[PDB]
Amino acid sequence: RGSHMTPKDDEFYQQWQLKYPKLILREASSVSEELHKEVQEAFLTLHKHGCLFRDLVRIQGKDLLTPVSRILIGNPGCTYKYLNTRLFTVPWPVKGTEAEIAAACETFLKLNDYLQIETIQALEELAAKEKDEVDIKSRAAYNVTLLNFMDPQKLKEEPYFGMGKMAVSWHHDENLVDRSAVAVYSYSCELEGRDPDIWHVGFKISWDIETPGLAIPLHQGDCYFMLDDLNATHQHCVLAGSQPRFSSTHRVAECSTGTLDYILQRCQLALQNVCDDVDNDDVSLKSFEPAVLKQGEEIHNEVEFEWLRQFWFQGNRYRKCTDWWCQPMAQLEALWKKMEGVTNAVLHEVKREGLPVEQRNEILTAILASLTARQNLRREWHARCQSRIARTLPADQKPECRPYWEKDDASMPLPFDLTDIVSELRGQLLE
Numbered sequence: 001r002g003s004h005m006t007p008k009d010d011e012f013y014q015q016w017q018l019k020y021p022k023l024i025l026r027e028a029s030s031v032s033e034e035l036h037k038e039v040q041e042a043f044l045t046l047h048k049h050g051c052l053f054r055d056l057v058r059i060q061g062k063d064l065l066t067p068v069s070r071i072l073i074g075n076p077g078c079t080y081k082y083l084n085t086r087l088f089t090v091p092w093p094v095k096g097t098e099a100e101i102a103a104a105c106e107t108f109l110k111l112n113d114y115l116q117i118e119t120i121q122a123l124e125e126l127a128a129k130e131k132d133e134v135d136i137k138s139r140a141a142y143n144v145t146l147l148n149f150m151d152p153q154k155l156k157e158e159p160y161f162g163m164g165k166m167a168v169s170w171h172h173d174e175n176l177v178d179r180s181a182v183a184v185y186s187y188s189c190e191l192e193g194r195d196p197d198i199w200h201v202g203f204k205i206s207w208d209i210e211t212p213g214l215a216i217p218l219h220q221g222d223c224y225f226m227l228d229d230l231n232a233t234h235q236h237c238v239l240a241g242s243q244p245r246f247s248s249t250h251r252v253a254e255c256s257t258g259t260l261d262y263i264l265q266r267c268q269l270a271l272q273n274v275c276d277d278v279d280n281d282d283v284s285l286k287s288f289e290p291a292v293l294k295q296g297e298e299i300h301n302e303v304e305f306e307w308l309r310q311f312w313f314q315g316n317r318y319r320k321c322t323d324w325w326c327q328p329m330a331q332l333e334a335l336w337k338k339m340e341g342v343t344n345a346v347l348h349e350v351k352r353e354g355l356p357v358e359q360r361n362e363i364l365t366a367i368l369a370s371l372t373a374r375q376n377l378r379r380e381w382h383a384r385c386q387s388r389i390a391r392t393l394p395a396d397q398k399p400e401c402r403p404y405w406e407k408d409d410a411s412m413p414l415p416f417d418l419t420d421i422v423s424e425l426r427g428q429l430l431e
């Protein structure tokens with residue numbers, strides 16, 4: 001059957017060195033006990049001014065409410081997207097918002113600083129065994145942390161090695177920089193194989209349940225480290241104890257599409273196709289080059305769904321932690337309407353009377369896939385935030401479908417449903 005090893009077993013410490021050397025442990029003793037408290041501070045400071053939320057994620061086509069409660073803290077303007085769920089940062093006091101909360105954040109920045117030293121240190125020693133040093137620093141340049149909290153007393157049975165009950169099931173970490181590390185700080189409050197009452201992080205090789213898996217006991221204060229490509233070659237998971245448990249997992253998030261600066265400049269590029277002397281509801285474009293015309297209709301989709309729909313779907317939760325994204329999400333919504341107008345503008349032009357059908361159809365082909373995907377995704381977002389696991393959530397937890405308007409709204413140039421604006425266009429393209 002399936003086997004697993006812990007410190008209790010003799011094979012454990014030699015299995016660790018042969019098939020998981022890129023996993024690293026640092027027990028509570030490698031950390032000042034004053035840092036220890038001013039991290040155990042905010043785990044609860046943040047815990048009960050209630051900043052941590054269970055996410056309504058998507059896995060394998062089905063909508064789930066995750067056991068673990070979470071919060072993204074980190075670099076300002078940064079997002080981290082796992083499971084088609086874009087998390088936005090409660091921000092750090094980084095170089096260049098309530099009083100206690102903002103202290104919590106500054107703290108995990110200090111923690112972050114510390115780990116990122118320790119990560120580099122151990123990455124050098126790791127590298128000093130297999131025989132640039134700016135590769136090493138980037139892969140430790142953590143830009144976010146995802147805090148996780150679970151109280152076991154409120155779980156699935158670990159299938160392959162009988163490891164017991166799982167807070168988090170066997171997975172790989174998403175949206176990480178390639179070969180970048182992760183540093184976990186682990187805070188626990190208070191026999192054949194592993195102790196059920198203490199928390200473990202489990203480890204397995206990918207595609208492989210024949211090799212026995214590792215079950216690392218994590219006590220109050222212990223940090224572990226997934227180094228380089230180990231996250232890629234290895235699956236991991238979390239084994240639940242009997243007590244509550246907090247964890248700060250520090251990541252190098254792949255935000256090349258993930259930074260406010262990013263989505264903003266995307267918008268700006270999309271609006272270069274606009275006569276922009278005045279902000280009003282009669283959008284006039286500067287080109288109808290089918291190339292330019294898809295790029296903006298694509299940026300329209302990107303800002304809509306990867307940002308607005310994502311933000312508002314986990315409706316109202318940050319207003320608790322910070323208002324940081326408020327103005328920006330307003331501004332992004334603003335830019336988004338102008339693009340609803342740009343869309344309109346393109347539609348009015350494709351049935352304008354002296355337009356040669358030859359590149360009217362070039363224009364259709366240019367924008368069609370975009371307006372389709374805007375429907376597919378509009379349906380899916382409509383459906384997923386009024387599915388009724390979704391309204392079982394309480395007052396300020398509701399999935400808001402924003403933005404949204406209906407037929408009886410002439411403040412919007414276009415309908416929410418585009419079903420046969422779309423079909424209407426491909427009829428042309430066949431006839």
Ligand SMILES: O=C(O)/C=C/C(=O)NNC(=O)c1cnccc1Cc1ccccc1
Pocket residue numbers: 066082083146148168169171172173174175184186201236237238247249
């Ligand atoms: O608390 C720990 O020490 C371990 C935490 C942990 O492994 N978290 N995992 C993630 O944050 C994560 C990142 N990218 C994709 C998925 C996940 C976790 C996950 C997997 C399956 C269901 C819910 C959450």
Ligand code: NI
Pocket residue numbers: 171172173236
């Ligand atoms: Ni993980």
